[PDB]
Design a protein around this ligand. Structure first.
Ligand code: IJM
Ligand code: MN
Ligand code: MN
Length: 174
C-alpha cells in the first residue's frame, strides 16, 4: 500500500512505532487499516509539536498505566478534577488538561463531537484542520500565533503530500 509507505517516509520512526504499537495492541494491522495508521501518526505528531512550546505534559503516546499515573499525579498535586477520559496534554501555565483534535471535516463538526464525548468542561478542546482552520474552548488558542501556524503548516503539508501521491481522497472520506 502507498499509504503505509508514505507514513514511514514522512513521519519519524518513534511516531510510526508508537502508532503501530497502539493499533497492534487492539489487533489492528497498520497494513489493513492504513488510513487509521496515518491519522494516529498525524495526531501524535501534533500533540508532540504542541508540547514543544515545561508548560506542557504529554499524556498522549504513553501506555495506559504510565498515562493514568501521570494524570493521577497532576490531579493530586494541582487539585484539578480527575478527567473521565485520558487527555492529550496538560498546560501548567493555565493549569488545565487539553484535548487536541485533528479533522479532515469542518472544525465545528469535530469540536462539538469531542465536547459531547468529554462533557467535562474542565478539559480544554483544541481542534485543528488540514485547511489551516482551528477551533478552541472559549476561543483561547493557548499557543502563540507562530507556534500554532507551524502545526497548521505541517498539517497542510501532510495533506498535499498525500494528494501528490493521490491518497488524500481516501483519507478525507475516512
Ligand atoms: O486515544 C486517544 O486519546 C485519541 N484517539 C483518536 C482516534 C480515534 C479514532 C481514529 C480512527 N480513524 N479511523 N478509524 N479510527 C483515529 C484516532 C487518531 F486521531 F488517533 F488517529 C483521536 C484523538 O484525538 C485522541 O486523543
Ligand atoms: Mn488522546
Ligand atoms: Mn486527541
Amino acid at each position: 500500500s502507498a499509504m503505509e509507505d508514505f507514513v514511514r517516509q514522512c513521519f519519524n520512526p518513534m511516531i510510526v512505532e508508537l502508532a503501530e504499537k497502539a493499533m497492534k495492541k487492539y489487533g489492528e494491522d497498520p497494513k489493513i487499516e492504513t488510513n487509521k495508521f496515518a491519522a494516529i501518526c498525524t495526531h501524535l505528531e501534533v500533540c508532540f509539536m504542541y508540547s514543544d512550546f515545561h508548560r506542557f505534559e504529554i499524556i498522549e503516546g504513553r501506555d495506559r498505566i504510565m498515562a493514568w499515573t501521570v494524570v493521577n499525579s497532576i490531579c493530586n498535586t494541582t487539585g484539578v478534577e480527575k478527567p473521565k477520559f485520558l487527555p492529550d496534554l496538560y498546560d501548567y501555565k493555565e493549569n488545565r488538561f487539553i484535548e487536541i483534535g485533528v479533522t479532515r471535516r469542518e472544525v465545528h463538526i469535530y469540536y462539538l463531537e469531542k465536547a459531547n464525548k468529554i462533557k467535562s468542561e474542565k478539559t480544554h478542546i483544541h481542534i485543528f484542520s488540514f485547511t489551516g482552520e482551528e477551533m478552541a474552548t472559549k476561543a483561547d488558542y493557548t499557543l502563540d500565533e507562530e507556534s500554532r501556524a507551524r502545526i497548521k503548516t505541517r498539517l497542510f503539508t501532510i495533506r498535499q503530500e498525500m494528494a501528490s501521491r493521490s491518497l488524500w481522497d481516501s483519507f478525507r472520506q475516512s
